[PDB]
């Protein structure tokens, strides 16, 4: 298992504009298009992102291209962030994937806000961190996904996904 397979399980693949859990306009493998309520605004962002007139629909290849870009941007973002880099550096490989997963879903800023949990992961207090992470809107809003990520930080294995 690797980061791409992990995120492909959590996000799914849709080839037509769709609404995410929060109601935002999204496409492909979790690629957010706009927070704007307008479907037109969405279609416009899409064409800009692909370089073609897509009329709300893309190919598998196009989905994967946006995906490769998003994963790279997530990793680069952690590495440039002063609160995140040090945590990332401290972690083992599997746990690194779990932090990348969070950043991809909630953005750098969002993740950097989990001050206490970040401290705990740094200190390698797995159980304490799993419990703290669960006290969040995140856990209430996307519970099955949050649980998979949480278990990943907890155990340092891919068991939550070996199922899936």
Swiss-Prot record:
InterPro entries for this protein: Endolysin_T4_type (IPR034690), Glyco_hydro_24 (IPR002196), Lysozyme-like_dom_sf (IPR023346), Lysozyme_dom_sf (IPR023347), Phage_lysozyme-like (IPR052619), T4-type_lysozyme (IPR001165)
A Pfam family it matches: Phage_lysozyme
Impact upon substituting residue 117 to V: 50-fold decrease in enzymatic activity
Subcellular location: Host cytoplasm
Active site: 11, 20
Effect of residue 11 to N: Loss of 84% of enzymatic activity
Keyword annotations: Antimicrobial, Bacteriolytic enzyme, Cytolysis, Glycosidase, Host cell lysis by virus, Host cytoplasm, Hydrolase, Viral release from host cell
TM spans (from-to): none
Matches recorded under CDD domains: T4-like_lys
Organism of derivation: Enterobacteria phage T4
Effect of residue 26 to H: Facilitates transglycosylation more effectively than hydrolysis; covalently bound substrate
Family of the protein in this entry: Belongs to the glycosyl hydrolase 24 family.
Name recorded for this polypeptide: Endolysin
One GO MF term attached to the UniProt entry: lysozyme activity
Outcome following mutation: residue 117 to F: 10-fold decrease in enzymatic activity
Induction info: Expressed late in the viral replication.
Effect of residue 11 to Q: Complete loss of activity
EC number: 3.2.1.17
Reported function: Endolysin with lysozyme activity that degrades host peptidoglycans and participates with the holin and spanin proteins in the sequential events which lead to the programmed host cell lysis releasing the mature viral particles. Once the holin has permeabilized the host cell membrane, the endolysin can reach the periplasm and break down the peptidoglycan layer.
Recorded catalytic activity of this chain's protein: Hydrolysis of (1->4)-beta-linkages between N-acetylmuramic acid and N-acetyl-D-glucosamine residues in a peptidoglycan and between N-acetyl-D-glucosamine residues in chitodextrins
Superkingdom: Viruses
GO biological process assignments: cell wall macromolecule catabolic process; defense response to bacterium; peptidoglycan catabolic process; viral release from host cell by cytolysis
Record gene name: E
Keyword set includes Hydrolase: yes
Positions that bind substrate: 32, 104, 117, 132
């Amino acid at each position: 298992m690797n980061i791409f397979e992990m995120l492909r399980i959590d996000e799914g693949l849709r080839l037509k504009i769709y609404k995410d859990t929060e109601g935002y306009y999204t496409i492909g493998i979790g690629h957010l298009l706009t927070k704007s309520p307008s479907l037109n605004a969405a279609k416009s962002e899409l064409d800009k992102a692909i370089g073609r007139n897509c009329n709300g629909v893309i190919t598998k290849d196009e989905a994967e291209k946006l995906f490769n870009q998003d994963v790279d941007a997530a990793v680069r973002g952690i590495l440039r962030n002063a609160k995140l880099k040090p945590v990332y550096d401290s972690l083992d490989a599997v746990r690194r994937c779990a932090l990348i997963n969070m950043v991809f879903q909630m953005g750098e800023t969002g993740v950097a806000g989990f001050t206490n949990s970040l401290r705990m992961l740094q200190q390698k207090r797995w159980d304490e961190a799993a419990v703290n992470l669960a006290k969040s809107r995140w856990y209430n809003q996307t519970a099955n996904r949050a649980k998979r990520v949480i278990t990943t930080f907890r155990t340092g294995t891919w068991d939550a996904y070996k199922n899936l």
